[PDB]
Every structure is written in C-alpha cells, then in structure tokens.
Amino acid sequence: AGAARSLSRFRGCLAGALLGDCVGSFYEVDLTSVLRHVQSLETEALYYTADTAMARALVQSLLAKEAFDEVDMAHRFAQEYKKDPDRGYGAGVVTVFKKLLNPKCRDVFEPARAQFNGKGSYGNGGAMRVAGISLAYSSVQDVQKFARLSAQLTHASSLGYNGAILQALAVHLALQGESSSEHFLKQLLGHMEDLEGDAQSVLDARELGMEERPYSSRLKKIGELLDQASVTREEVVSELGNGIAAFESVPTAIYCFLRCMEPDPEIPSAFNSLQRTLIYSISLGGDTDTIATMAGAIAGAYYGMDQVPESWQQSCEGYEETDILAQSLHRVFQKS
Ligand SMILES: Nc1ncnc2c1ncn2[C@@H]1O[C@H](COP(=O)(O)OP(=O)(O)OC[C@H]2O[C@H](O)[C@H](O)[C@@H]2O)[C@@H](O)[C@H]1O
Ligand SMILES: [Mg+2]
C-alpha cells in the first residue's frame, strides 16, 4: 500500500513470505482441505523452514555489508546451516554448505558449479530466498544482477538462477504497486525472453531436453490460463508444476498471485487478497512451503502490511525479526 517501495510494501513483502513458508509447511491437498485448517490461525507455534532461514541470512548479509558481498553471504548461508541444519534443506545443497565451511575454499562460487555432475542445481532454493534482493535494489538491472549472483552461490544452472531472477523481478514489479495482471505478466515475459536468448541458457535447457526458453514458455501459458474458463488445480499443476524445480514452482507462484488479484467465489470473501493468494497457492499441493513463500512475497509487496493479518503473522516463528529486517532494508537501502 501507498507509494512504490514504501515501508508498508517492504514489511508486507517479508511478512507475506514468512506467512507462506510457515502456513504452507503444514501440508508439505484440496481447497476444502486448506480452509478447514487456517481455522487454527483464528504464539509462534509455526516453525519456518529453510526458505526463511536462507532469506534471513541473505538479508543479514546485505545489511552487514550495505552491499552484495559474495564471501559474506556464502559464509552466512553456510553458518546458518551449521547452526540449524534441520530446517528442511534440499538434499543436494547441503554439500555446498559443507564445502563452504572449509576455510581453504576461497572461491565461494565453485562448490555450486560442481553440483549434479557439474551441471548445477535447478532447484528453487535460489528463488525461495531472493525477495530481499528486490528490497535492496531499485533498478531492474541491479535486481537481475544480484538475483543471479546470490542464487549462483548454490544454483549454478541457468535453470536455477533464472528462476531466482524471475522471482526477484516479480517482487520488484509488485513493489511498484497497482497494475493489471496482463501488464505485470507482459513485463515479466519481456525480461525472461531477453535472458533465455543467451547461449548458456539455451544450451543448459537443450542439455535437459526442455523447451527452448522454458520460463518464457511457462509465462505464456500463464497468459493462456488467465483467459481460460473453469481452470482446475490439476490443469495448473500440469501446465506450470508444483515441484522443487525452479521452473515447476516460480511461474506457479506468479500465477497464484495474478489469479488471486480478483475475488474467487470458492474462497470466502472474509479472506483478504493476501490470504486468498496464500490459500490458493497451498491448495495446489506439492512444494507448498516454497510456492506459498514466493507467492506471499509478491502479494505482500503488492498489497502491503495492511493485509498481513495479526493472528496469522503472530503464529509464525520469527515474525518480529522478519519485520525488523524489512524495516532495516528500507532504512539502509531505500534510504526511507
Ligand atoms: N541438475 C539436477 N538434476 C537432477 N535433480 C536436480 C538437479 N537440480 C536440483 N535437483 C533436484 O532438486 C532438489 C533440490 O535441489 P537442491 O539444490 O539440493 O536444493 P534447493 O535449495 O534448490 O531446494 C529447495 C527446496 O528445499 C527446501 O525444502 C525448500 O522448501 C525448497 O522446497 C535436489 O535434491 C534434486 O532432487
Ligand atoms: Mg519447499
């Protein structure tokens, strides 16, 4: 709410991400499923998962250095894992952290490049933690630059880091406030068509038997889905995904945000737009903590802190630290 990149947008963004992670984590599903159990949320009994742990470390690094510092951020990721390994980290990425904890590893980007036979991870862990990049950086150029670099600390495949860029761009656009769904999608599509024309990206996708321009292809499917009658959960999962791959989760989160910009008759009117976006995301099943954390980041940035319900927020572990960090990003980087 209010001006582009306002404090309310910053706070709502990180709160929305925290809500999606914590509320989503129960069901790691059917719209009726979800509605019964948000009943519960009507202190800090909902633990956050690796999505929030890594987002907090990313943001703490940015604040400590008042800039992107790959060595600081890589070590804060590794030390966060060492301090609290049981947050549900991906099976592969834990190898990166263990290599980064070795004090004689001195290029912090190389462990990620060794992952998965030297092709790199395409998991959504780079995207799940990236919203803080869009709070720290106002220009599109800087959002893409450091969304990519922050993601490359663990996700060296263009299929992974282009998902992180796409998530950061969506948060970036949402922080600018009111827009049509079609304009929001169109801007995202243009940026991704630009990135997926790159040779390394084309090959990375070739090598795995994928569409050329996989993110672009899914963003076009979102535009079709937004015009389609009687869209079912099954159709959404089939065309976009609900999985741990960034390309099976990041477009899906953006779809959830765009679809839920308007009221949905099968979700009670008593829920506001942020809540309805989270309820819809979680109803898709699959990687619910991560799809909801990403949809919640976007919706929180767009709708602002006035749509973060206190009862839901106060159920989440660390909600006050999350808020402090949002306020600090606004002070340090948005220079209020
Ligand atoms: N190149 C690849 N080839 C085959 N499988 C892959 C590849 N890349 C990723 N995977 C599969 O993808 C998995 C994850 O890739 P990882 O890099 O370990 O971790 P993340 O940080 O992305 O995990 C993010 C999630 O973890 C948290 O629970 C959050 O809630 C998110 O849901 C691998 O174990 C592989 O099965
Ligand atoms: Mg997850």
Numbering used by the authors: 14 to 41, 46 to 59, 70 to 363
The authors write:
In WT ARH3, Asp77 not only interacts with 2″-OH of the terminal ribose but also coordinates MgA. Thus, Asp77 appears to be important for the maintenance of integrity of MgA and the optimal orientation of the terminal ribose for catalysis. Structural analysis of ARH3D77A reveals that MgA is missing. This lack of MgA causes a large-scale rearrangement in the active site. First, the terminal ribose is rotated ∼37° using MgB as a pivot. Because of this rotation, which is an even greater degree of rotation than that found in the Ca2+-bound form of ARH3, the 2″-OH group replaces the metal-bridging μ-aqua ligand and directly interacts with MgB. Consistently, ARH3D77A shows a 23-fold increase in ADPR-binding affinity, compared with ARH3WT. As a result, the 1″-OH group is displaced ∼2.4 Å toward Ala77.
ADP-ribosyl-acceptor hydrolase 3 (ARH3) cleaves PAR and mono(ADP-ribosyl)ation at serine following DNA damage. In contrast, ARH3 has a unique ARH fold and a di-Mg2+-containing catalytic center and can efficiently reverse not only PARylation but also mono(ADP-ribosyl)ation (MARylation) at serine; ARH3 can also cleave O-acetyl-ADPR and α-NAD+ in a Mg2+-dependent manner releasing free ADPR. While coordination of two magnesium ions (MgA and MgB) significantly enhances its catalytic efficiency, calcium binding suppresses its function. In the active site of ARH3, acidic residues, including Asp77, Asp78, Asp314, and Asp316, maintain the integrity of the bimetallic center and render the ideal alignment of the substrate for catalysis.
